[PDB]
Amino acid sequence: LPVSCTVFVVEDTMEGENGIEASWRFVSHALRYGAGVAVHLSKLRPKGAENGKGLVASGPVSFAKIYSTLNEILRRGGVYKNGAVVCHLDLSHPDVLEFITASRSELPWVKRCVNINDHWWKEATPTVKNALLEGIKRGDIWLNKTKVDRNGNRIRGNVCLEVYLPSRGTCLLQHVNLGGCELDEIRGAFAQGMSELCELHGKTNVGESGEYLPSETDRQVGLGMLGLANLLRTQGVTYNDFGRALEALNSGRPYPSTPGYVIAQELKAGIQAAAEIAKANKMERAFAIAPTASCSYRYTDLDGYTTCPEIAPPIARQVDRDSGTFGVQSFDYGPVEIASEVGWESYKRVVDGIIRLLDSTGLLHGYSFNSWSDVVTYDEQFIEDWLASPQTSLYYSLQVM
Amino acid sequence: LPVSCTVFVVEDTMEGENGIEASWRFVSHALRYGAGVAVHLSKLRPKGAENGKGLVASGPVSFAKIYSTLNEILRRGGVYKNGAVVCHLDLSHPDVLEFITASRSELPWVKRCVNINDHWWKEATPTVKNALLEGIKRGDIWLNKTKVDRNGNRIRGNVCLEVYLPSRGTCLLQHVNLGGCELDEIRGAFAQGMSELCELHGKTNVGESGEYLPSETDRQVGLGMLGLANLLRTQGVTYNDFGRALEALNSGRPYPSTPGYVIAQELKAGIQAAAEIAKANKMERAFAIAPTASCSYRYTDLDGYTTCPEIAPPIARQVDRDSGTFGVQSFDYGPVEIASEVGWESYKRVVDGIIRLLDSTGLLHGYSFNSWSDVVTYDEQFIEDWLASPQTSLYYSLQVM
Ligand SMILES: Cc1cn([C@H]2C[C@H](O)[C@@H](COP(=O)(O)OP(=O)(O)OP(=O)(O)O)O2)c(=O)[nH]c1=O
Numbered sequence: 001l002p003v004s005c006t007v008f009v010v011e012d013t014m015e016g017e018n019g020i021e022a023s024w025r026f027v028s029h030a031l032r033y034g035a036g037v038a039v040h041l042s043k044l045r046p047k048g049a050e051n052g053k054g055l056v057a058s059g060p061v062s063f064a065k066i067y068s069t070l071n072e073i074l075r076r077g078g079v080y081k082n083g084a085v086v087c088h089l090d091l092s093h094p095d096v097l098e099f100i101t102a103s104r105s106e107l108p109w110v111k112r113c114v115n116i117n118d119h120w121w122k123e124a125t126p127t128v129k130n131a132l133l134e135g136i137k138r139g140d141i142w143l144n145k146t147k148v149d150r151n152g153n154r155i156r157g158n159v160c161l162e163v164y165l166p167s168r169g170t171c172l173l174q175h176v177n178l179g180g181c182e183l184d185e186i187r188g189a190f191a192q193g194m195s196e197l198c199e200l201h202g203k204t205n206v207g208e209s210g211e212y213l214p215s216e217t218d219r220q221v222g223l224g225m226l227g228l229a230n231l232l233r234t235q236g237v238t239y240n241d242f243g244r245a246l247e248a249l250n251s252g253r254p255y256p257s258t259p260g261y262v263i264a265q266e267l268k269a270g271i272q273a274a275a276e277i278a279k280a281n282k283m284e285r286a287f288a289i290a291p292t293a294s295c296s297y298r299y300t301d302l303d304g305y306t307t308c309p310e311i312a313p314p315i316a317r318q319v320d321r322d323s324g325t326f327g328v329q330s331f332d333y334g335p336v337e338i339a340s341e342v343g344w345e346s347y348k349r350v351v352d353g354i355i356r357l358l359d360s361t362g363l364l365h366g367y368s369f370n371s372w373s374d375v376v377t378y379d380e381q382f383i384e385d386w387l388a389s390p391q392t393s394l395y396y397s398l399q400v401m
Numbered sequence: 402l403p404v405s406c407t408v409f410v411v412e413d414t415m416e417g418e419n420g421i422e423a424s425w426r427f428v429s430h431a432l433r434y435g436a437g438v439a440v441h442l443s444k445l446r447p448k449g450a451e452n453g454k455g456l457v458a459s460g461p462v463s464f465a466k467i468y469s470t471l472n473e474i475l476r477r478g479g480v481y482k483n484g485a486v487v488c489h490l491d492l493s494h495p496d497v498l499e500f501i502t503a504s505r506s507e508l509p510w511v512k513r514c515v516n517i518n519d520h521w522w523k524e525a526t527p528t529v530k531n532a533l534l535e536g537i538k539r540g541d542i543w544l545n546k547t548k549v550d551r552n553g554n555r556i557r558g559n560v561c562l563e564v565y566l567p568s569r570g571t572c573l574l575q576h577v578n579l580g581g582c583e584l585d586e587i588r589g590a591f592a593q594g595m596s597e598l599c600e601l602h603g604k605t606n607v608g609e610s611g612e613y614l615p616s617e618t619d620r621q622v623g624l625g626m627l628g629l630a631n632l633l634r635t636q637g638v639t640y641n642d643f644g645r646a647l648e649a650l651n652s653g654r655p656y657p658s659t660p661g662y663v664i665a666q667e668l669k670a671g672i673q674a675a676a677e678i679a680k681a682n683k684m685e686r687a688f689a690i691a692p693t694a695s696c697s698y699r700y701t702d703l704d705g706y707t708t709c710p711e712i713a714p715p716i717a718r719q720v721d722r723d724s725g726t727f728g729v730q731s732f733d734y735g736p737v738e739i740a741s742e743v744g745w746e747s748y749k750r751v752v753d754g755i756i757r758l759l760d761s762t763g764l765l766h767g768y769s770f771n772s773w774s775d776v777v778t779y780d781e782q783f784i785e786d787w788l789a790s791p792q793t794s795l796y797y798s799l800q801v802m
């Protein structure tokens with residue numbers, strides 16, 4: 001199916017409609033088509049908890065092994081080999097420590113994400129914090145925040161962390177190419193994208209298979225953006241200037257009409273237009289920023305160069321992608337600013353400003369924030385700053401220098 | 402349930418009534434109650450077989466890992482911890498070699514049995530034979546023969562190898578205590594046991610759960626025997642004399658009326674009476690010899706000593722059984738002959754004679770033959786002799802001296 005991702009929550013019982021065995025069947029079905037899953041194990045009771053009629057429960061870390069085996073077998077046998085599994089878990093779970101410290105031999109083919117917020121982080125003991133920092137520094141444990149819908153009932157993130165869905169949901173995404181649109185066309189492009197997304201929401205028919213929710217009950221769609229670096233290059237605006245202009249616009253402070261200010265105002269106007277169009281069709285959540293590693297390569301800017309993925313600056317001007325089918329393809333991002341030159345502060349400020357702009361309308365799913373391992377030093381201060389900032393995830397740990 | 406064992410055969414398809422996923426659910430259900438399973442993987446296509454719509458199949462050895470994980474988790478969490486899994490496989494399967502050589506790290510918590518006969522053994526290449534001999538010498542691979550019902554449709558052995566059942570079947574067993582019955586009472590005891598088994602066959606209601614076959618369609622029961630060594634001791638008959646008498650009786654040759662001959666004639670008469678009673682109730686198969694390690698300890702002979710398990714001679718006169726609940730219990734088998742003193746030949750001849758007597762009526766399931774590793778040298782000649790002899794399995798590799 002076109003469904004890129006799906007979300008499943010497993011109840012604390014072996015059998016049922018959403019039982020662990022039903023979880024095995026659903027994961028097998030999702031992997032046989034290539035779509036990834038995010039099996040949330042936050043409800044399984046802790047390991048060693050005795051009920052009285054002796055059933056010494058094993059805990060989520062035990063079933064992680066079953067999911068790992070299923071993933072390995074089916075992905076190596078599956079038609080689509082791009083599927084992945086992400087076994088989310090909470091930070092308040094008493095088992096989290098074990099979940100953090102399991103070596104790659106025990107759980108070889110499953111990524112791991114931790115749902116954290118202010119309360120659980122504060123309550124966590126120092127040992128758990130140190131284990132989390134060590135894990136993230138080695139690139140094993142991802143982070144994600146917790147957000148409740150307007151009714152207060154919990155919603156859960158997907159595989160790639162920027163879309164928030166309920167149980168057995170699905171994800172519909174569409175990307176707007178900033179590099180390929182002129183400054184005046186931004187609002188029109190945003191309106192066209194949002195209208196197309198609203199129209200396409202009701203014609204997917206994903207839920208007909210009986211595994212997914214019906215389309216009428218979802219009321220969600222994600223309008224992401226890609227190709228910011230090319231736009232900044234074309235207008236001759238550096239990341240520092242764009243970040244300062246975005247911060248000034250968001251704070252409401254007066255600012256001179258520099259090109260960065262014009263771009264920021266155009267982005268705000270387009271976001272507002274898209275928000276109005278979505279509100280017309282009764283869309284709960286509209287804006288979601290997802291990585292475009294597999295989608296950016298098929299688009300081009302005005303000058304003919306390849307558009308940079310999402311809004312971050314490309315690590316290197318030229319990228320050589322190796323695929324077993326089409327071989328090795330060497331593409332160029334043009335004379336754009338790259339990670340080492342811009343610096344950590346400019347990138348962080350720019351992403352924070354854009355995420356604040358998108359969130360201002362209240363229709364934000366999330367963002368798949370990266371992290372440059374060769375520049376910043378992982379510390380509890382870094383996690384505190386990440387939690388304080390409007391970001392909503394921590395995806396990968398790259399090397400830039 | 403009282404069901405000691407069950408048999409499942411998995412088809413070559415992911416979904417269905419007997420699909421691999423149905424196999425996972427059935428194995429989980431069987432393990433949650435302690436009853437073991439014998440998941441026959443002889444129908445899964447070989448690893449690496451391509452169909453054209455790319456599905457590079459993994460093979461049975463891959464799903465052995467899923468079954469191992471399920472067994473580990475559920476047995477350590479299961480209420481009854483006596484459950485076990487035995488992943489049968491054929492000798493003609495092109496994957497058998499891998500199945501034989503997998504180390505204990507890959508498949509830690511699943512036993513392995515090989516279904517062999519004359520044709521497959523002859524067709525097997527030397528490397529497979531050497532791998533099988535090495536495996537059996539280390540006590541990893543068990544053997545079992547192939548037998549077809551009166552209609553020619555294949556039937557499959559259970560976990561402990563002496564009962565032959567169809568898919569989703571069950572096993573009903575009852576044991577006759579030779580040590581606790583006088584020489585004249587043998588026929589009456591056999592008749593009583595067979596009548597009780599026939600009566601109890603139709604009142605188990607195992608198939609009401611929807612997983613097992615209905616009781617009306619089974620038409621099977623197993624009348625085993627235990628406590629031969631005590632009987633031989635009481636009558637003052639050594640294993641050699643009893644074996645010679647049994648061989649003479651079976652061959653039809655004239656023989657003097659020695660005590661061994663009297664015992665053999667009584668056994669034959671009792672077997673014939675039980676066979677007639679079973680045939681009265683239309684029983685397809687009636688006689689099955691199973692190990693009594695967990696059942697012999699609750700019975701006593703005429704002199705008050707504990708009866709020896711099945712028909713083999715006990716390894717040591719005194720046995721100290723350690724259980725976490727009742728602690729350590731030291732029981733005595735009395736002044737009975739033991740393994741080293743009797744020798745391999747006498748034991749082999751006695752078991753062969755008794756199995757021939759039981760098979761003479763055509764109502765034999767099988768026998769769980771042991772093997773003394775410290776006496777016999779494993780060679781292709783040994784396997785040839787085992788195949789030639791009326792035995793039907795090869796269970797464990799013990800040490801006697
Ligand atoms: C039976 C069993 C349960 N468990 C644990 C893990 C599951 O999350 C949890 C679900 O057990 P349940 O299936 O709900 O056990 P139960 O219904 O018989 O008893 P109760 O209602 O009190 O739970 O039990 C094991 O880990 N291993 C086992 O073998």
Ligand SMILES: Cc1cn([C@H]2C[C@H](O)[C@@H](COP(=O)(O)OP(=O)(O)OP(=O)(O)O)O2)c(=O)[nH]c1=O
Nearest residue numbers: 074077078413414415445446452456457458459
């Ligand atoms: C899809 C898939 C199949 N297989 C192998 C193992 C199973 O024994 C076997 C069953 O596949 P099927 O489910 O029968 O595949 P199919 O129905 O789409 O195509 P066909 O009818 O030709 O089989 O395929 C894998 O090993 N891994 C996989 O991911």
